[PDB]
Amino acid sequence: AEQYQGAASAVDPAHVVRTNGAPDMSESEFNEAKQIYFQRCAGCHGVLRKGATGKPLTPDITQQRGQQYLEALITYGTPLGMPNWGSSGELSKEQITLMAKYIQHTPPQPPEWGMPEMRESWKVLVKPEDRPKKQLNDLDLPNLFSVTLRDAGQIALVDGDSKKIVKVIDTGYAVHISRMSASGRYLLVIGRDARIDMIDLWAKEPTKVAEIKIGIEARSVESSKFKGYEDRYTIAGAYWPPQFAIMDGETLEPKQIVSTRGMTVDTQTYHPEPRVAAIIASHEHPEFIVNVKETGKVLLVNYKDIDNLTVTSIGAAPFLHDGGWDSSHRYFMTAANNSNKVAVIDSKDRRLSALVDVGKTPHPGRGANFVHPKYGPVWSTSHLGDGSISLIGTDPKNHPQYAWKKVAELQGQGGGSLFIKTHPKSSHLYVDTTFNPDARISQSVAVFDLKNLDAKYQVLPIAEWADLGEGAKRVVQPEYNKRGDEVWFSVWNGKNDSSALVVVDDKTLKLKAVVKDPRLITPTGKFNVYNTQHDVY
Template sequence: MQNKSWIGKTLALAILPMALGSAWAQTAPQMTPEEMEQAKQIYFERCAGCHGVLRKGATGKNLEPHWSKTLDDGTKMEGGTLKLGTDRLEKIIAYGTEGGMVNYDDILTPEEINLMARYVQNEPPIPPEFSLQDMKDSWNLIVPVADRPTKQMNKVNLSNVFAITLRDAGKLALVDGDTHKIWKILESGYAVHISRMSASGRYVYTTGRDGLTTIIDLWPEEPMTVATVRFGSDMRSVDVSKFKGYEDKYLVGGTYWPPQYSIVDGLTLEPIKVVSTRGQTVDGVYHPEPRVASIVANPAKPEWVVNVKETGMILLVDYSDLENLKTTTINSAKFLHDGGWDASGRYFLVAANASNKVAAVDTKTGKLAALVDTAKIPHPGRGANFVHPQYGPVWSTGHLGDDVVSLISTPSEDAKFSKYKANNWKVVQELKMPGAGNLFVKTHPKSKHFWADAPMNPEREIAESVYVFDMNDLTKDPVQLNVAKDSGLPESKAIRRAVQPEYNKAGDEVWISLWGGKADQSAIVIYDDKTLKVKQVITDPEVITPTGKFNVYNTMHDVY
């Protein structure tokens, strides 16, 4: 693909807010009912996650036909897709921007790009709500608990199994981390966003962009789906209850649409309770679509940390009494996205990516510990923890919109780290990346390396590579590993994006997804963490558009 960075810079200007004297009179391009249905599906699959179902924007820009707002100084700002027009929108969709939007000219056809340029100039259709009764109607208990094995019936080392999303295939691959062999591929629903593990390590829970959640039992001779339920029409995160006495009793799931979180039985997925997240933002403005982003379970209390994207509210949901649900609401910043625990397990850090901040919650006191300014559009995944040779314990995040990785000093009750206290909740160092577009960073307690990807960068070579920093000398440039070339696969017209480094349980291997197009062969490339040499390439024809990978042990124990 041609070099597009200059195009991205130019087109990024086209979607900045525009100060205008009055609204304009353009009318939306007409579309047939068939075109509308096709565009709705593409928007759901490719666009809604960043721009929102109602197109009010979050990680991505507002895509309403017309919007206006008044700034603190009284200036009225107006913008919208109608003002941009079809030709301009086609270029933005085709070539992307350096703010983190990828180019779609190797994903969508020219006809589909034109279709989407016209679609976003029309008013967004509003999907139906999804009630507790709707959840109950969707619930499917395939294997009751009493009919499941009472002990592990296979000889697989379950703690080193990888759950790998096969995004566009609507499947999940379970891969034996010891043998590098595919154990089983199961139907999972479209575009699984996350796999969570039960507190026991027996079950894998998946959820994704069609709102479907599944439980996969790892104890039978071959893993099998034992229950499913639909939480809504789009969702991103689930987690089980982990506090002592409540292990796996409940599971909470948060939806992008409708904006709510729901609680179900942790072993059967039988629906129990639905709670709406609609309400006021941290700015005091009502929002109709506050989507639930990341969710984590606090192992030290019977509570979940639920992050509400558009409002900037962090909810601590106490599940000890569901009939009299208690929730602590913490104001942070917009728009909350993903995050992870610090090394102590006391603080949860989450990206407020539209505010260019990271919010830190003290789950011991139930209060906001800090709002840390970062570079543009932080996107940590779960982040990465390590002890910096100069600044002590740090948690790190990459950025969709800037070419750095931010290292944030975190508190520790260990006396040997007390000398770093003055640095706590500050960005103590920025590691230079070759460009913006990072999604995930990762390291391991047994490793000297720090890995970062850049799959959302518009440059082929950058997007197809990962970058490895030496934690013993963070002044050195990172080592570039071109995952696409290392895979041994033939070149493709579409960019094969190298995404989400994930360690095995031992911390001596790093697995990278090489995410190609639907029609192209994708791969999982496994590197030796010490030598940075390729150990294995998994290129089975069924490995279609692999993205997220979750090692059972590391996910259970928050090792990152």
């Protein structure tokens, strides 16, 4: 067996390259720069630097540019998305020098996270046997609102009708979203630290029954929703490591782990860090629809047989991020934000229906579906790069002329928008502008009359209605209640500042309530149980 595997490797030694020629930096210096890199740069440039949103920062490129090009670029930034760390005064000349030296070295390697680590992190707090057989409290679970108290690493269940915080549960740091099990009993939350918590809404007092950590960093979680699979499996995508994990939908036991490392859809070259973004459960087949960002692939992971996984890798467009179902729940309208496109994934026929060109940096969230008087059923989205609102036709059967076309546009307060919203019972369309550099715009939301779309929008002074005092008071993500007569908004203020949840009477557009509480720290995402569980948007 020794002489058999004894012939030379076909790989040419000359072409295998050693890495160096980097400026010398001590342990203290290298760590200070490493800490800055993850607190300030990692989000956009990635953990490895092959590059996300912007150009790669690998040694081959950085050393080519040299110390000074790097110091200067980091110092003033660029008009294409790269913040000015020097001019703004964010970082010192000394620090920027350190970062320029740092990016000239081989990127340090973060740990991997396989089954051993997963199982070690897996915990069953309350076994399925020991869990109640019926609802042991008199809460109106369907109208409950799971609110993320970001910096607190908790979530608060707010009663829809009473406007009170019914329970505060400790979770992973800065939970990114909440999702509901198909049965409507379990609430699944995932922190950016990849920590998932499963919460039983039937317990006397809603409590965590299981937990697990599926990676170092993550964003999405979902539950199986195909007929005959209620609470069967639970999936979660991770940023690092580039992977997603399928787990038991009852105990959260890790079953399968799949690497999303691979070839890009555009250049068809290898990308060592294709982060997993949105994940939505199919209703057409027993599959999960996974978005793989950097490679721009939409994976149809079939869980009919989890031991021998079948995945259909559909090419879309680079930088897939968020998105949601069309009115019929068959077409996944997802946004390839830095490509300025919205990919239409047919979950039934399992193929890319079309690539719709939209405004700069679309950010639909899960989007807004409504029937246009002239264009029929459409799905809409606002943007981060401009104040447009794209309306895309979603009816190939009865409206072929408008299917997959940016049929019309609306104009909002400006760019920096994050979430557009509406409801089957509502006649209004809201658009927030959370990251708009103007304080007044970023603290208010635009509202359109669906019954008269030619009319300009109305501006609701959300943050002002909260009456909180100092702070940026950024408003974010409109969200209806089960009956669709009220729309909730989060007044995302600092951790040491005061925050609130503003409710609006959708019928009159008048302030209805304001939820304040010392525990309501940095409220961001809000997810009404029913509307979330049944994809009502």
